[PDB]
Design a protein around this ligand. Structure first.
Ligand SMILES: C[C@H]1CN(S(=O)(=O)c2cccc3cnccc23)CCN1C(=O)Nc1ccc2c(c1)OCO2
Ligand SMILES: C[C@H]1CN(S(=O)(=O)c2cccc3cnccc23)CCN1C(=O)Nc1ccc2c(c1)OCO2
Ligand SMILES: C[C@H]1CN(S(=O)(=O)c2cccc3cnccc23)CCN1C(=O)Nc1ccc2c(c1)OCO2
Ligand SMILES: C[C@H]1CN(S(=O)(=O)c2cccc3cnccc23)CCN1C(=O)Nc1ccc2c(c1)OCO2
Ligand SMILES: O=c1[nH]cnc2c1ncn2[C@@H]1O[C@H](COP(=O)(O)O)[C@@H](O)[C@H]1O
Ligand SMILES: O=c1[nH]cnc2c1ncn2[C@@H]1O[C@H](COP(=O)(O)O)[C@@H](O)[C@H]1O
Ligand SMILES: O=c1[nH]cnc2c1ncn2[C@@H]1O[C@H](COP(=O)(O)O)[C@@H](O)[C@H]1O
Ligand SMILES: O=c1[nH]cnc2c1ncn2[C@@H]1O[C@H](COP(=O)(O)O)[C@@H](O)[C@H]1O
Lengths: 331, 331, 331, 331
């Protein structure tokens, strides 16, 4: 084996991230303005815009979930707060009309009670929200939710970064599989634990397990540019979950911060010391202030529309069949 | 598949840019001073110097087109201005002697009228000027022009970045095919849409479709150094179109700008907010002031001549047969 | 041969370092808090924590060896000092309870006398401490020690970076093989001599020779993050030796240094001019002050535990079977 | 073809530079102090130290040639000066004892007269000094010199970067072949002409043509560290020619320059505007002042000796059989 040892499987794959690839232009009769950006969030729920906001306490509370739903996407309410409060945020979103909303739950002691309170509040999507879904506790939670409230509520499981892990969630009954172990902008898992999976390869592998069962993949983490949304969907994801790209917006939690004449907002990992309050796997940082969500989403969707025009993709299902070119460091 | 999924065609190629390769020296009896730099712009038009200036409003108006023609190349007049004015710039270039000149047209409502006004003004080359020529509207425009005014006017189509797209333009009747989707110095398509094609690979692929039909390829975008001109031609292009490298010159539109003691000129993408006035795919920037065009062209051609000496290429047609070595990031 | 010449063996391998790989998550029922971090230092000695401190005069004297043993690892006392003093440091560590301790010896004139004085002082591990163990003098020293004091003392040999070199140490009787030629943070061997071996590949190759004989591999040098510890063990090492990561701690030799408002400690290679006092193969540098050792070890072990959770490794022997993904420069 | 087009030979090789490889340690009974560093400069001339100074007007005049010879290497006197003066510098070196000395000649009108004046002055080595030796004029000059003065004078030809070019020089009668097109620290040929060949691959290819005919290869350009000398020799070169590494020394031409409190000397390409006085292929720069040559050579040879110890190379001929590991950008 060229890289050492005698086991060809020790280094299992070459992992590509978004920056490693570009979408190739293809024959197109699709104008960007006329592309259909709708896509499956879950087996039953289709969004007008294939974007959901991260379940983080510096990204999604009720204000963000309302704005996301109104822009045609969805918010996933974070779970770093009392059950009663999270449930009350779900109610607040429902007070603002017939708006879709999701909410995160863990697999800890209080997770089941949280899930039931969220169901009672009228939540549409429960997101079983872990760093590692390839685990019997997580698979059991997904399965139990699906068997208990699955007729009325769609159940997302995550996160995973391999084909086997995605397959396990599918078998447990997940209505969507969320992909991303280690790629987040505020993530330090790669350096703390040495664990991760570059996101284009992780998506390609998860989709290989999920698409044949009609289960949509949510690409979660590592998206830095609107072009990354198109790349993630072309790799086969059906939606993208965004943290950093939405944390700078007016609708995200937190105050404006002024440093050296420029405006920022705080953005922190849910595994940072601050969020957990220990061996943290995220940092506390800041992102540039970006203005209203509606405006940010317009630009992100605009980039996606451009990609759909270049690739001749009339729908997201067509974009999922687009081809890449791999690029070098020089590119 | 080592990079993920089970489809070997999902990642279709490894795309190389100029910085990824060097020309290998070869047996040579060619002195740089004696190399013949002439090359086909189109099937019928041969230039003394294989360089044309970009159809951009911070690169080519009448002054630049005149200087380019006099230096042995050609200018392509930009189309971000009224039809009457563009036509009047064509006339101005013709007032300055028997000088070749080209002009850009789109495929919009006013494009046909623009094309006819340019023909009436005496234009030599019409450049159907789009970001994505692999499209029925663009192919139809090329074909219609070629069938209508093709006896007197050469018709260039672009831009493309794949073999299939180049083949389509050839079949539509293009007299030259322009290659470059995403490589421009002021381009943000790669980050906004996630779309692009590294230029050495794009040229190699376009040439595979164009050379067998005797259709010249114009390498457009991404050329940063005189050495890149030689690389582009060696990959099989017949001419290079330059934006950034010519925008700093006296003959380009725009005033001198002084910042921190150094001289610059503005250089902006035609897809920047400023040029379009929205989801822009270019930036507004600045380039160092470079002095007279004649001097810049002398240096660029000097570098090309050096390459022809090292590779033993007496003509551009010989240079098109030269070989590369691929280099690493360290190189 | 694509890279030149006609000999496929001239460039023998593609060498990967820690930064080139990530651990892939796998099915897991292992909680990080419940993982067993114990591992073989040598054939007979098992540590609670798979970490030993470098035999360097800015990393390990008696204070560090005591703290390392108490944290569940071990210190290797440096040998840049008189025999009587090194022996006295061994005694000092033994005065502090039933604590494991190692000590370095060379292969020079005084090395045997040093080894015997260390044995008399009660040392548990002798580390034959060289930059290049693939040498008859080094192999002879290992063998002689093992045949003379091997019933009571475990004998480590190093350093190596190839399968053949590791095999030679195994045959000489080593109780552990230490791997690392050129990877240290303060090392300049790569630039001075042009010699080295990227550490993931070096570990994979050494383990291929050592594991079949039940000889543990100590990964020595180049570990910059807690995640690198997990990577090294997953590549098949049984323990990691740390210099830079422990040199910033309270228990390391040397005073606090204040530069530009921040706190540092000096950290220097044993092949630096200063340490040898000439063609040095190390630098004299500084590392950020890190606080108490106990705290640093907690964080390092915390990262390892996280990796064990993600990979489903209940023990270090299980972690040694984990798989990698290779990543690109972009990642 | 993965990188584009249908011709597998268009991109002929993957070119490695020094930074792309490391020497692998091997079984060794060689102490660095006892290695034999002697090596063939030409078929007949063996140096004690395998180093020659570049024929550049900021590196080698009589003072440098004397110091190089005394250190066991050789200087090549530059030719950017009148014939009478260059000849007088050769005489000056001969006045200082039985010291070896070389001198550069071109292939221009005055080159033959220069060569004869140098022969009359007692030169030992004539270096036919060009940027591209794969040329009938250069091959003819080499052949004519060898047939005319070859009994008393060794004739070096260069530069080349391919197997074919090296083969041509061998057939012309060269006593050594100098390798390096584009790698020099002050070289801009790579960006001006787009031409070059990474030096490890260039050496491997040249050696494939030269070693079977018993013709030594001189590695010229791109050596930045003492470790690069060992790499070049291991790739099969017999000596290394140094510009940048020797330009900072007391014995090089030029005055000390003080900028921002630090000491430098000027170092310029022979293809820079300044040296030629136009399309330059070198820059005018500065290098840190390094002190006496004797000291610099001691450190360079010290690094080489270290490499010989690590690789078990008792002689340079043994070092030429050493193996590499290829490293990644991360390494
Ligand atoms: C505190 C939580 C959440 N984060 S996080 O906030 O940083 C985080 C949140 C969401 C997605 C993430 C995607 N990649 C990295 C971290 C992500 C990391 C640590 N953590 C775990 O649950 N770790 C863990 C890991 C493996 C296990 C296990 C527990 O028990 C069985 O096997
Ligand atoms: C405003 C124009 C021109 N630019 S530009 O100014 O930035 C630009 C100009 C010239 C060459 C370019 C080479 N690469 C990138 C951009 C380039 C980009 C956006 N644009 C389009 O026409 N986009 C578009 C794309 C695909 C389509 C489609 C329209 O309809 C069918 O399929
Ligand atoms: C002074 C000592 C120790 N260092 S060090 O302090 O920089 C050093 C110490 C420990 C581990 C190291 C891992 N890689 C690099 C250097 C390391 C380097 C120089 N050195 C040698 O012994 N060199 C040497 C090399 C090869 C030989 C040989 C001697 O005789 C036969 O073959
Ligand atoms: C002025 C001289 C010397 N230099 S230099 O000073 O920059 C230079 C000097 C020495 C080694 C060099 C190694 N690589 C690059 C440049 C090097 C470059 C330009 N030059 C040439 O002779 N160029 C040339 C090239 C190819 C030809 C040809 C002439 O006629 C036939 O084919
Ligand atoms: O602390 C953390 N460490 C690692 N990943 C996190 C953490 N907090 C949230 N995440 C994940 O990172 C995603 C956001 O990534 P981003 O959009 O690149 O910033 C989130 O949706 C989570 O999946
Ligand atoms: O706004 C833009 N975005 C992307 N490409 C552009 C834009 N404007 C012009 N171009 C193309 O970029 C080329 C100039 O590239 P440059 O020489 O690298 O600066 C032009 O000839 C166009 O093909
Ligand atoms: O001067 C030196 N040059 C090269 N390697 C050294 C030197 N001194 C110590 N080492 C080795 O570098 C290891 C420390 O590496 P680090 O943890 O990356 O700083 C040590 O355990 C030694 O194996
Ligand atoms: O102007 C120049 N351009 C390119 N190569 C040069 C020039 N002048 C000298 N050289 C070559 O560069 C070598 C020095 O390279 P260096 O040791 O990397 O600085 C010289 O021995 C020449 O072969």
């Amino acid at each position: 084996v060229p890289t050492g040892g005698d086991d060809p499987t020790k280094i299992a794959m070459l992992g590509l991230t978004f920056d490693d690839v570009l979408l190739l232009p293809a024959a197109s009769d699709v104008l960007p303005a006329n592309a259909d950006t709708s896509s499956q969030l879950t087996k039953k729920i289709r969004l007008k815009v294939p974007l959901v906001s991260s379940a983080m306490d510096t990204v999604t509370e009720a204000r963000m979930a309302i704005a996301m739903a109104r822009a045609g996407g969805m918010g996933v309410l974070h779970r770093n707060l009392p059950v009663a409060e999270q449930a009350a945020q779900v109610e607040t979103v429902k007070r603002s009309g017939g708006l879709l909303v999701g909410a995160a739950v863990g697999v800890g002691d209080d997770a089941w009670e949280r899930a039931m309170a969220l169901r009672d509040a009228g939540v549409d999507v429960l997101v079983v929200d872990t760093a590692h879904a390839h685990n019997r506790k997580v698979l059991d939670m997904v399965h139990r939710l699906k068997t208990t409230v699955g007729d009325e509520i769609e159940v997302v499981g995550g996160n995973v970064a391999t084909r086997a892990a995605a397959a396990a969630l599918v078998e447990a009954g997940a209505d969507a599989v969320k992909v991303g172990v280690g790629p987040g902008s505020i993530c330090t898992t790669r350096v703390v634990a040495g664990v991760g999976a570059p996101q284009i390869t992780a998506i390609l592998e998860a989709v290989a397990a999920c698409a044949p069962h009609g289960v949509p993949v949510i690409a979660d983490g590592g998206l830095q540019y609107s072009g990354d949304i198109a790349k993630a969907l072309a790799a086969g994801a059906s939606t993208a979950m965004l943290g950093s790209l939405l944390a700078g917006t007016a609708e995200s939690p937190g105050e404006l911060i002024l440093v050296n004449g420029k405006q920022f907002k705080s953005y922190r990992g849910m595994g940072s010391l601050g969020a957990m309050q220990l061996v943290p796997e995220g940092i506390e940082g800041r992102v540039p202030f970006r203005g209203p969500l509606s405006t940010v989403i317009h630009q992100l969707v605009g980039g996606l529309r451009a990609a759909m025009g270049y690739t001749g993709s009339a729908t997201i299902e067509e974009l999922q069949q687009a081809q890449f070119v791999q690029i070098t460091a020089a590119g």
